[PDB]
Amino acid sequence: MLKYIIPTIMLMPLTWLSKNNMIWVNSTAHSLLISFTSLLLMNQFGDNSLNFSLLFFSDSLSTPLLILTMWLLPLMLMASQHHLSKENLTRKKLFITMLISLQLFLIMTFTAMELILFYILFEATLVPTLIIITRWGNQTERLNAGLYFLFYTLAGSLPLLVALIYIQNTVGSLNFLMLQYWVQPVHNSWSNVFMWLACMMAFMVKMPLYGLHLWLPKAHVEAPIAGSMVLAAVLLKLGGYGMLRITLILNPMTDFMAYPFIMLSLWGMIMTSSICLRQTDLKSLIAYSSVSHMALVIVAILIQTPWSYMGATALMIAHGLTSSMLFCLANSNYERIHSRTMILARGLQTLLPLMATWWLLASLTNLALPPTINLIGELFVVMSTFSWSNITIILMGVNMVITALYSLYMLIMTQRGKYTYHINNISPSFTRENALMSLHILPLLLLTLNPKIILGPLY
Amino acid sequence: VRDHWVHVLVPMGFVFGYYLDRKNDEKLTAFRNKSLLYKRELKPNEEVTWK
Amino acid sequence: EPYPDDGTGYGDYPKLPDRSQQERDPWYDWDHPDLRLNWGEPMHWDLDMYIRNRVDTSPTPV
Amino acid sequence: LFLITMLILVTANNLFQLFIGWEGVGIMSFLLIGWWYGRADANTAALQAILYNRIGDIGFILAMAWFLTNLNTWDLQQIFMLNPSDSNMPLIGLALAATGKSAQFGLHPWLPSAMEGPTPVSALLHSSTMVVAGIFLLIRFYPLTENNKYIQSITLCLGAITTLFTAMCALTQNDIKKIIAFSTSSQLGLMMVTIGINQPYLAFLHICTHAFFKAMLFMCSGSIIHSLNDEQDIRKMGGLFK
Amino acid sequence: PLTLEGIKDRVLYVLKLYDKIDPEKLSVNSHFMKDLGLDSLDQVEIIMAMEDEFGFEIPDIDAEKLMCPQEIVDYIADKKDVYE
Amino acid sequence: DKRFLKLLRFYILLTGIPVAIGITLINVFIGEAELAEIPEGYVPEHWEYFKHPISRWIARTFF
Amino acid sequence: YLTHQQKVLRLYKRALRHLESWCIHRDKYRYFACLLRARFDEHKNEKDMVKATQLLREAEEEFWHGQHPQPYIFPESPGGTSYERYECYKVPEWCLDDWHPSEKAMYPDYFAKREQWKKLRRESWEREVKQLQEETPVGGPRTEALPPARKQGDLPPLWWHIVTRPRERPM
Amino acid sequence: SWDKDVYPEPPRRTPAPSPQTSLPNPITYLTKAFDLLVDRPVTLVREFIERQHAKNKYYYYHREFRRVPDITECQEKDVLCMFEAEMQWRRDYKVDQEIVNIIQERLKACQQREGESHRQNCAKELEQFTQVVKAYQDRYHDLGAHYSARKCLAKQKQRMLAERKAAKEA
Amino acid sequence: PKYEASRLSSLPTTLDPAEYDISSETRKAQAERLAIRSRLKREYQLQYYDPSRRGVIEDPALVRWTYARSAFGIGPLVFWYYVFKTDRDRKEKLIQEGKLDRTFNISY
Amino acid sequence: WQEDPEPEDENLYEKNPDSHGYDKDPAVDIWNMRVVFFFGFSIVLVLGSTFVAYLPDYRMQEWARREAERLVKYREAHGLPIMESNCFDPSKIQLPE
Ligand SMILES: CCCCCCCCCCCCO[C@@H]1O[C@H](CO)[C@@H](O[C@H]2O[C@H](CO)[C@@H](O)[C@H](O)[C@H]2O)[C@H](O)[C@H]1O
Ligand SMILES: CCCCCCCCCCCCO[C@@H]1O[C@H](CO)[C@@H](O[C@H]2O[C@H](CO)[C@@H](O)[C@H](O)[C@H]2O)[C@H](O)[C@H]1O
Ligand SMILES: CCCCCCCCCCCCO[C@@H]1O[C@H](CO)[C@@H](O[C@H]2O[C@H](CO)[C@@H](O)[C@H](O)[C@H]2O)[C@H](O)[C@H]1O
Ligand SMILES: CCCCCCCCCCCCO[C@@H]1O[C@H](CO)[C@@H](O[C@H]2O[C@H](CO)[C@@H](O)[C@H](O)[C@H]2O)[C@H](O)[C@H]1O
Ligand SMILES: CCCCCCCCCCCCO[C@@H]1O[C@H](CO)[C@@H](O[C@H]2O[C@H](CO)[C@@H](O)[C@H](O)[C@H]2O)[C@H](O)[C@H]1O
């Protein structure tokens, strides 16, 4: 993985040694080159994972998440450089450095063989993410958003550390390849019940599980655009990736331990989808939309079927592009009217015809129109949970209806109707913004032609 | 060139990273041509099956 | 008139009549004609439920 | 695009490809019903069509899930070959999906509301594209429904209540486009009745014949409306014979 | 395509088919109350015929103010964007 | 809006057309490999287990 | 807010429109419209205003019972089939400010005339604000009525968004 | 182009034309037009391409995996042996998935091919499909997303113990 | 037959008994309401008509609304828990007994 | 206190009507559009989509099919079951009891 670690590290001297007016050009250009080389990780085999060294490996689960991570860095750079234009040069370079350091931790997190190494990197992502929100958010309550985000995580992550160290003592190793062969069944006991919860609750908070989700809308409303993009697209999936890995060593106890979380997820997805129908902050609506989509991922992971794991992988990738695109669309309006209130600026299709098309496409993928990979992932989960219990189709189907309702409600409210009379600063869409939207949706739709590369190891 | 010398940094980082990935495989050759699956007789001009 | 003092969390936000925006005079020169609101007037707590695309409370002939 | 999504639906040989067309016509109808997007009632009607059709889509995904779980397939060829006898659940799902798509009683109001769209939309929506898709889906599955008396009884009564209720609504409507829309709902109910008496090929013949004169009636109403400067109330027409 | 003269011709044409108005006394400036002796019930019926003549509604708040043919011509011209 | 779509079209076609032409020439003049039994005593290279010339170039160069 | 006279006149118009929805045919409507008018003319000279209010209240109870459930609506009136149909084509005039110079070059005459209006607006604004200050009592406006211009060369205060509003059929 | 034994088709029986009308058959003239205007130019382009292909004949091979000891022969926790056995079991699992896919393709082709007589004439395919699905279900069903040769063996031994008990009670 | 108002169908204004008895106190209140409306209208209009203004006219009423709004918990989880748990216990019991049909079920 | 007033929002189009929205300096703005469009669309999306389209048998699903065809041919030619229930030979298993 050094061919990705080192050039990512070199982005830092590139940014600091660039001419003052070239920092965005150079960092964007070279981060795109790193993203191109990331496609060499597609050398996956049917039986064995791609095991580079004693520290790093890449299977079909981590590879799509790696590609998404390195694709997202140039997009965040493009999305950030406008609202940071007045920032002084050193603080701009520090901002870009946080984004680069976030990529560094993320690609190492997704490729670590040993689970303590994954833990340290998994925890290290907190620092630049917290700094990005509290330093470069606009509003007063970004400070509280940082503390909620920080302490929700550490409330779950410290028990995980204790469990991980306990598991190594008992088993002798935390190398994930070793765990596949030395794994032993988890028998029933109160000790194993708390081992299970310690192994899982940290990832539940990240997803976030319904009932542990209130940090997320708080974080999004305060974060700058790049913060929301990485948070929605990658940082949530750290918990999804963590669960997909650690469930290996939790059988058969997951059989009955999953129930309360499945109930929270299955009911939570309806609750959060309904909440979206009444949200007045556009960013908060997209944040609640993520909670609803990630509830499906949690169910998929917990029921542990080949179909559910494939759906979970596709849903995680598909949501990452879709939700990141929606924050970018929401942010493009915000950079004109300086408000996140959804009802403030209406009828924008009359004023911004092509941005209306991007809104339309983002909404269509959000409601999982066939054959977008959004639907492929959702459909696979719906398929698998029906076998788990046929009654789940009722909650799955109802959630589909509500998702279509709030997705299109977003579109109708902001883009259709009459334009607000007094808002007279809706300038034409910039090339940067149109490129940013298209750099989300085009790869997302191209993945329809070859979905297999996002379906994960169970494919 | 003082104008564009910084544009070799990430490309050089990739070459160095590629080279170090290859050197690490040289430390993991304990089973080269020894797995039951792939073990064979060396070809006449072959020193090692992979490198 | 505020909402009744409970833990519900309305604070001092006024309790306004539970009527749809469809019931407002369509001929009056509203600052927001699509919503039938004037700039500065207090908005119903459930305005987003009472827009013309959603819940209608208009009198019915039956 | 609306025509293309329909031809995907009609030529589909597996349920996933059919679902692509199913949802495609749904979203194209959303875009065309809400053509005049500055009008709140147009946006409301467009979203209403999405709402009712996604309720019927619950049936579609149920049938997809049953067929995969129990028959290991989404291909029509394998489903008909395995010929399940306990087909109550998959067919109830298909009937629900047909009820939304073909505006049968219960999920019926969206079809008359769809008159918000420009008249050519109504002509194509009601004749050769969206609304007959629900009927077409059930005709595609006659190898299963012809062996299920319980499913036949359900579709029979659903069509009967539909054909009578919507024809009764049409008796008093004053908007010319709504009278024709309720005529389509009633004609759809008759098609559902034909499915209920185990006459799938007759139901299919009515789809074809209906397309010609229903699309003509809309085009004639559009001719009148255009000549009367967008008047659609029949109480303000009259004396147009010559 | 409406014209200021075209609108005026049709407004007076309608009024000249109203038995309570004598077509000889009618001009564009005739007040419906002071010159023609009509009442406010009559005025409501005149506005209704204008709505029927041109096929659009004049809201009650505006209609009550239109007391002569010229004010109707002005009102119709303003809502239809007729400048000639 | 029109300028963006022209730029998008130009930069997609800037390499798209050369790649589309390159694929056609490779298919026409090099063509695909033909399946054969492994000759007795022959050890194929790992990239000789793939049929399309671009695929076996990818396997040879990068994988 | 509405006078008694306004309420009676509103009811008469509303009653006549619903009666037409029922009658449909013009000859039938003419007959029943005259009968309806005679019901209003009967109590035209009622000077007891408590009795007059009773007459109107019963009349409105009668109207609610006898109204058409699907009355005729003019196509572009609120609730009609063409209401707001053309809003999507209405584009505010400030949007032209953002036109690219090559787009503006396609209409040199139009954009020179637009500059004169923008100059007229800029030079008038201070006098409009001043006129409104002088004519507004201490408490502020008590009604929404706006005044005319009082001198020569003055424009009626707050005219721009009335005068330059989109055409009803803008495209 | 493919093995006719793997993907069999019965011999085809096409009736000869037997016109009972003096009117010309439009399909016959469209068929001749299609041959002249579509097939021949298409065939000419293809023959040029194949001529280029014959100048550069090169081969690819189907990879052969030697057999290695199964998980049954692996000492507990001996990852070097377990690894090779696990990889072999995973390759076999993918192969068995494609064996089922072949049999399902046979069944579906027969259903379409036999038309309104499929229910009777596709019985042999239906039976073969029924058996392979049962064998496939026994091997791999209910293992879960974290499947392994170990879990697969545990299932077989559970099945073998249930079969030994039932035979004993008989 | 009198009108019965409902939550989703209001009393018509022409049928409302308080619309025909308007006293001096009621008229005074209406004037006070019109005065508040007119004052806000002028404040809005002086900005909306200002030729030099480019941007958004911030509405404190809108801000108060979003601020106020941005400021049945185990029962359904328990209910759904017993629905799915009861269903899966029943299903598991039948599979162990062989009484559930899974003849062609090889996708999960 | 003593504090600066809030700056007024700036429209990039007023000074540069040809702005791509990347930078106030037109030369930098044009360069930044070019790298994004070239490295984003011309390289990663176009060449990356081509690279993915031609991956050498991603995860052996083509090899598996060929191998399945070889085994189905062999087993049917020798009167063997297409597939056996048992994944592992019973002879190599010692059951408990
Ligand atoms: C002996 C062990 C220590 C090994 C140290 C090896 C590195 C030594 C570097 C010495 C040269 C430092 O160079 C000095 O700092 C920076 C970047 O270089 C330059 O100035 C910089 O200003 C801005 C950034 O703020 C940019 O335009 C650009 O990065 C550069 O011009 C100075 O003009 C140069 O005088
Ligand atoms: C959101 C959080 C969700 C939390 C979900 C909580 C699930 C609770 C699971 C309860 C079962 C716990 O595990 C249970 O522990 C006891 C320990 O005494 C074990 O039982 C053991 O102790 C008891 C003593 O009472 C003995 O009778 C028994 O012989 C012995 O084996 C059980 O074999 C095991 O089933
Ligand atoms: C291995 C892959 C590496 C890919 C890296 C891609 C980075 C692309 C960045 C391009 C940005 C170029 O931006 C700018 O263009 C020209 C280059 O002559 C120069 O601009 C100007 O510089 C001096 C004069 O001042 C002249 O020599 C030059 O002719 C002139 O154009 C700037 O010095 C450079 O900063
Ligand atoms: C569309 C642009 C895509 C750019 C990326 C692809 C660039 C390179 C693509 C084609 C490279 C040439 O393709 C290559 O040609 C020869 C066939 O002549 C093959 O080579 C094989 O046959 C040739 C003889 O013909 C001999 O060297 C030998 O028998 C064997 O190695 C390679 O296995 C094939 O991969
Ligand atoms: C999505 C595309 C991303 C593109 C990113 C571009 C990064 C640049 C990577 C260049 C790597 C070239 O690396 C070099 O290629 C040659 C190809 O002859 C390989 O050459 C070797 O390949 C195999 C290895 O068993 C054998 O055929 C033989 O040993 C030799 O030919 C070398 O093993 C490799 O060191």
Q: What is the DSSP string of G41-105?
A: HHTTT---HHHHHHHHHHHHHHHHHH--SS----TTSTTSTTTTTTGGG---GGGGGGS-HHHHH
Alpha-carbon span H112 to H85, nearest angstrom: 41
On whether any CB of chain H is under 8 Å from the CB of D78, the answer is: yes
Centre of ligand 1 to C-alpha A13, Å, is: 11
Ligand 4 contact via F11 beta carbon (within 6 Å): no
CA H58 from chain centre, in angstroms, equals 27
Cα G27 versus chain centre, distance: 31
- Give which of D21, E4, I76 is closest to A395, Cα–Cα: I76
- Cα H6 from chain centre: 7
HSE toward the beta carbon, residue A35, CA cutoff 13 A: 29
Q: Which residues lie across from F24 on neighbouring strands?
A: none
Q: What angle do CA C49, C53, C56 make, to 5 degrees?
A: 65
Whether residue H10 is preceded by a cis peptide bond, meaning omega within 30 degrees of 0, is: no
Bridge partners of I9, per DSSP, are I6
Name the CA radius of gyration of chain E, rounded. 12
- Residue D138, both tokens: 């059930």
Residues from G in contact with J at Cβ < 8 Å: 98, 100-101
Backbone angles phi, psi at C54, to 5 degrees: -120, -120
Specify the 3-state DSSP secondary structure of D233.
strand
Chain J residues 18-47 within an 8 A CB cutoff of chain G: 18
DSSP letter for A51, please.
Answer: E
CA H127 to each of CA A405, B28, H111, H122: distance values in angstroms, whole numbers, following the listed order: 47, 50, 13, 9
Compute the distance between CA of residue D18 and CA of residue A370 in angstroms, rounded to an integer. 10
CB-based contact J44 A432, cutoff 8 Å: no
Per DSSP, the three-state class of D77 is helix
Q: Which residue of I has its CA nearest to C12?
A: I68
Selected for mutation to probe chain A from D31, D69, D70, D73 (highest A CB count within 10 Å) is D69
Which regions of chain D does DSSP assign to beta strands (E)?
none
CB E50 within 8 A of CB E71: no
- Provide the shortest C-alpha distance from residue A421 to chain G (in Å): 8
Output the six-digit token pair for J23: 């930078």
Residue A58, helix vs strand vs coil:
strand
Containing F35, the helix (H) or strand (E) segment is strand F34-35
Q: Which of A279, A427, A420 is nearest to A346 (CA)?
A: A420
Return the residues preceding each gap in chain B, C–N over 2.5 A, or none: none
Residues 6+ away with beta carbon under 8 Å from A316? A65, A237, A240, A241, A297, A377
What residues of H are in contact with residue D73 (Cβ under 8 Å)?
A: 104
Evaluate: CB of B8 within 6 angstroms of ligand 3: no
Q: Are the CB atoms for G72 and G17 separated by under 8 Å?
A: yes
At G11, which amino acid appears? L
Phi-psi region of A67 (alpha: psi -120 to 50; beta: other; left: phi over 0): alpha
Q: What distance in Å separates the CA atoms of residue A29 and residue A31, rounded to the nearest whole number?
A: 6
Left if phi > 0, otherwise alpha if psi is -120 to 50, otherwise beta: which for H144? Answer: left
Using CB atoms, which residue from J7, J43, J59 is nearest to A45? Answer: J59
| Spatial distance between the Cα atoms of B25 and B49, rounded to a whole number of angstroms | 13
Omega of the bond prior to A252 within 30 degrees of 0, cis? yes
**Alpha helix segments (H runs only) across J9-56:** 12-15, 26-35, 48-53
Q: Which atom number of ligand 5 is nearest to the Cα of residue F61?
A: 17
Task: For residue A372, give Cα distances in angstroms to A317, A408, B39, G61, J55.
Answer: 12, 17, 44, 57, 22
Give the Cα separation of D194 and D184 in Å (integer). 15
Query: Which 3 state secondary structure label does DSSP give F38?
Result: coil
**Sequence-ordered list of residues with C-beta below 8 angstroms from that of A101, at least 6 positions apart, any chain:** A12, A128
Q: Please name which of C32, D34, D43, C12 lies closest in space to residue A343, comparing C-alpha atoms.
A: C32
Cβ of J22 less than 6 Å from ligand 3: no
Q: Which 8-state DSSP code applies to residue A417?
A: S
Cα–Cα–Cα angle for F35, F39, F45, nearest 5°? 70
CB contact under 8 A, J54 and F7: no
Task: Indicate whether residue A165 lines ligand 3 (CB < 6 A).
Answer: no
Does the CB of I78 have a partner CB in chain D at under 8 Å?
A: no
Computed on alpha carbons and rounded to an integer, the radius of gyration of chain J in Å comes to 33
- When divided into structural domains, chain B yields a total of 1
φ and ψ at I6, to 5 degrees? Answer: -130, 170
Chains F and C touch (3+ CB pairs under 8 A): no
Instruction: Give the closest residue to A127 by CA, choosing from A160, A171, A157.
Output: A157
Q: Closest ligand 1 atom to the C-alpha of A90?
A: 25
Contact E79 G168 (CB under 8 A): yes
Q: Which residues of D touch I108 (CB under 8 A)?
A: 69
Resolution (A): 2.3
**Which residues are bridge partners to A112 per DSSP?**
A56
- D43/C34 CB distance under 8 A: no
Beta strands (DSSP E) in A209-344 are none
Which residues does E74 contact at the CB level (< 8 Å), separation at least 6? Answer: none
CB crowding D84-102: b at 16 or more within 10 Å, else e:
beebebbbbbbbbbbbbbb
> What is the token pair recorded at B1?
């060139």
Question: How far apart are the CA of A187 and the centre of ligand 2, in A?
Answer: 10
Reference A315, options A331, A295, A332; nearest CA is A295
CA distance I38 to chain A (A): 18
Strands F34-35 and A50-51: unpaired
**What does the block give as tokens for E73?**
């011509």
Q: What is each CA distance from H166 to H159, H169, I101, in whole angstroms? A: 11, 5, 20
**Token pair recorded at residue D65:** 């899930």
**Which amino acid, H149?**
A
Strands A57-58 and A50-51: antiparallel
Query: What is the C-alpha radius of gyration for chain B, rounded to an integer number of angstroms?
Result: 18
Identify all chain A residues contacting I65, using CB atoms and an 8 Å cutoff.
Answer: 280
Atom 21 (ligand 4) nearest CA: H58
| Ligand 5 close to Cβ of residue A36 (< 6 A) | yes
Collapsing DSSP states into helix, strand and coil, what is residue I80? Answer: helix
**F30 interfaces chain H, CB cutoff of 8 Å:** yes
Chain I residues with CB under 8 Å of H136 CB are 106
Q: What is the dihedral of CA H123, H124, H130, H133, to 10 degrees?
A: -140
B4 CA → ligand 3 middle, Å = 7
Q: Is the CB of B47 under 6 A from ligand 3?
A: no
* Rounded CA separation A383/D62 (Å): 9
Contact E56, G77 (CB under 8 A): yes
By what technique were these coordinates determined?
cryo-EM
Start-to-end CA distance of chain C, whole Å, equals 32
Which of A52, E61, H53 is CA-nearest to residue F29? H53
H57: which DSSP letter? -
Q: Ligand 5 centroid to B9 CA: how many Å?
A: 21
Reported as type and span, the H/E element at residue I42 is helix I24-48
Tokens of F43: 């050890």
How many other C-beta atoms are found inside a 10 Å radius of the C-beta of residue A431? 23
**Helix A89-111 and helix A236-246, axial crossing angle in degrees, nearest 10:** 20
Question: Which residues have C-beta within 8 Å of that of residue A50, sequence separation ≥ 6?
Answer: A41, A43, A44, A57, A58, A59, A63
If you measure CA to CA, which chain A residue comes closest to D35?
Answer: A416
- Distance (Å, whole) CA A149 – CA A218: 9
- Cα-Cα end-to-end distance for chain A: 23
Question: Which class for A300: exposed (0-12), middle (13-18), buried (19 or more C-beta within 10 A)?
Answer: buried
CB contact under 8 A, C62 and G78: no
CB contact under 8 A, A424 and G88: no
Q: Which tokens sit at H111?
A: 């259903």
Domain that holds residue B11: 2-51
CA distance A343 to D22: 32
Burial of residue A347, with CB atoms counted within 10 A of its CB: 0-12 exposed, 13-18 middle, 19 or more buried: buried
Which among B10, B12, B18, B48 is the best mutation to test ligand 5's pocket, defined by most ligand atoms within 8 Å of the CB? Answer: B18
DSSP output for C1-62: -BPPSSSS--TT-B------GGGS-TTS--SBTTTTB-TTSPPPTTHHHHSTTS--------
Q: Is the dihedral of CA I47, I53, I56, I58 positive or negative?
A: negative
Per the rule left: phi > 0, alpha: psi between -120 and 50, beta: everything else, J21 is: left
Q: Which two tokens stand for residue A175?
A: 């190398």
CA–centroid distance, J34 to ligand 1, in Å, is 28
The residues of E annotated with a catalytic role in the active site are: 39
Token pair in block for residue D210: 């209906």
- What is the whole-number distance in angstroms between the Cα of residue A38 and the centre of ligand 5? 15
- Whether ligand 4 lies within 6 angstroms of the CB of H52 is answered as no
In order of B8, D131, G162, the CA distances from D31 in angstroms are 50, 16, 33
How many residue pairs bridge chain F and chain J with CB atoms within 8 Å of each other?
42
CA-based nearest residue to D176, from D234, D117, D111: D234
Atom of ligand 4 nearest to the CA of F47: 33
Please report, for residues A74, B9, H19, the alpha-carbon distance to residue A429 in angstroms, rounded to integers and kept in the order given.
Answer: 20, 34, 68
List phi, psi (to 5°) of G83. Answer: -60, 130
